[PDB]
Amino acid sequence: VTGIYVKYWIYVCAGMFIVVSFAVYKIVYMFLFLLCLTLFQVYYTLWRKLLRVFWWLVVAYTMLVLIAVYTFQFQDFPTYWRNLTGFTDEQLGDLGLEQFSVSELFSSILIPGFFLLACILQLHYFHRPFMQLTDLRLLDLAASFSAVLTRIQVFVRRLLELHVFKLVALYTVWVALKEVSVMNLLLVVLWAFALPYPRFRPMASCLSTVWTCIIIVCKMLYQLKIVNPHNCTEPFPQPLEINQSLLYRGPVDPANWFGVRKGYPNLGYIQNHLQILLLLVFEAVVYRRQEHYRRQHQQAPLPAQAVCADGTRQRLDQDLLSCLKYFINFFFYKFGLEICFLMAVNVIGQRMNFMVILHGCWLVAILTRRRREAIARLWPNYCLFLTLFLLYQYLLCLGMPPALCIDYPWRWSKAIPMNSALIKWLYLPDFFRAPNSTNLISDFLLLLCASQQWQVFSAERTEEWQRMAGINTDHLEPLRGEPNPIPNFIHCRSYLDMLK
C-alpha cells in the first residue's frame, strides 16, 4: 500500500503531552505544559530547530521517567535528606511521586509510558516530517471525486487564509467576557487594537501567543499554596440582602480578581486559554500552509483578497454562478456600511443600557452625513473612539478590587437612593447586581465590522483593486445621452437576469 505519508504528523505527539499533563497535580506536570508552550512560541518565532527541541523533550521525558523510577523504593527519605533545607513534606513530597503501588502507580507509569514510545517514534520520524514542512466505474469516479475534494480543499483553505484572525479575535473576547478574569485585559487590549490597525495584526498575534502561555502557567501553578494566608465584615446600615452577593458575604480571594480559581477537573478551568492557544497556533499553521503552496505556485489570485478569482465586475452580469462567486469574495466590499449600521442596531438590540445611548447618538452622527465621503471624513475618528469605548467598557466591571473591602460610592446614594435596576440600566460597576459583560460580544462584533470597513474605505483611495469590483460612489448620471454601463436587463433571457 505504502500509505505511510499520512502517519508522519506530530499532532499525536503533541496531544500525548497534554494527555499526560492532565489526569496529575504535581510540579513536574508544569514542565510538560511549559514545553508545549515553548514549542508553540517556537512555531510563532522560527522553524527548523524543533528536531533538537523534540530530542531535548525526549530527554526531559526520559528524566521524568527516571524521577518516577527512582521513587519506587523508599528513597524519598534520602531525597528529603539530600534536599538543601527545602523538603517540608510538600515542597518536595506532594509532587515527589507518592507511590500508591496499586493503581495510581500503574497510571503514573503508563501516562509517560506512551509518551516515551511516542518520543522514540518522533525521534525516528523527525527527518521525513521535516521534508514536507520545509523547502522540500470505480477508479475513475474515485479519482475525479478526490479531485473535487482537492478543489474544495483549496476553496476552504483560501477562505480560511483570512477570516480566521477575526475568528480568533471573537473567541478570545468570548473567553474574556464569559469569564471576566482580569490579566486577560491584555488580550482585550491587543485584539481591540489588532482589528482596526493593519500593521498591528501580526504583532498582536505573537504577543497573544506569549501572554496566553503566561496565563496558562499562572493557571497551572496553584496546587499547594492555600487561600487562607492570601475578609470584609459587613456594615449593616444599601439594599436589604446586600450582605449576600460578593463583598461582605464571603472571604474574598485576592487573586480571584487576577483570575485564580483552582478548579477540580484541572483542565476545564484551563480549556479556555488552551483553545485560545490552539487557535493561535492553527492561525500560524494556515499561513505557513499558504507559503507551502506559494513555493510551488501563486498565492496572489486578485489584488484585493478574494476567493474564486474568476468572478469579475463584468462577469457578474453573466450567470448565477459568477454572481454567487462575486458575492462570496466582494460581499462586505459592496455592503459594508449597511452591515455596520445593522450591527450598531444589534448592540442596541441586546443591551438597551445607558452606555449604548452613545452608540445610537454616534449612529445618528454618521447617518445625518448622507454621502459616503461625509462619513469617511469622520469614520476613523469614530472607530478609534469605538475601540476606546470598548476598552473603557472592559475597564469597567472592575473599579476598585474586591480584595480591598473599600466599597463603591453608591451606598451613599446621593440622598436619592436608586434601586438595584437603575444601577443595572446605567452601567454601574457594582458587586450586588454584577453588570453583564457577556452581552458585550455584539459590541466587539461591531468593532470588527467597522475595522474591516476601514479597508473598504481605503478602496476609494486605492486604484489597486478597482479592476475587480470597481467603484462604489453614490453618484448616478443625470443630463446624459446614454450612461449604459450594463446592457438592458428588463427582459430576462437568462436565470440571473430573472432574479435581477
CA distance 299 to 276: 27
CA angle (289, 290, 293) in 5-degree steps: 90
Tell me the angle at which helices 185-194 and 201-220 cross, rounded to the nearest 10 degrees: 170
Q: Which residues contact 221 (CB under 8 A, 6 or more apart)?
A: 30
Pick from 387, 58, 48, 36: which is nearest to 209 by CA? 36
Alpha-carbon separation of residue 20 from 16, 35, 38, 52, 229 (angstroms) = 6, 12, 17, 21, 31
Cα of first residue to Cα of last residue in the chain, in angstroms, is 53
CA distance 438 to 173: 9
CA 247 to chain centre: 31
Task: Confirm if 223 and 94 have CB atoms less than 8 A apart.
Answer: yes
| Helix extents (H) in 239-378 | 271-294, 320-329, 331-334, 336-350, 357-367, 372-376
How was this structure determined? It was done by cryo-EM
Which residue type does 324 have?
Answer: L
Q: Give backbone dihedrals phi and psi of 120, rounded to 5 degrees, phi first.
A: -70, -35
CA distance 206 to 42: 10
DSSP state string for 197-229: -STTHHHHHHHHHHHHHHHHHHHH--SSS-TTT
Task: Confirm if 91 and 223 have CB atoms less than 8 A apart.
Answer: no
Instruction: Enter the C-alpha cell of residue 389.
Output: 469605548
Exposed (0-12), middle (13-18) or buried (19+): which is 159, by Cβ within 10 Å?
middle
Task: Confirm if 196 and 451 have CB atoms less than 8 A apart.
Answer: yes
CA angle (402, 407, 410) in 5-degree steps: 130
Pick from 305, 323, 280, 367: which is nearest to 44 by CA? 280
How many CB atoms neighbour CB 285 within 10 A?
14
Task: Confirm if 223 and 27 have CB atoms less than 8 A apart.
Answer: yes
Instruction: Enter the C-alpha cell of residue 422.
Output: 437603575
Q: Which residues contact 403 (CB under 8 A, 6 or more apart)?
A: 231, 252, 253, 254, 257
| Helix extents (H) in 160-199 | 165-178, 185-194
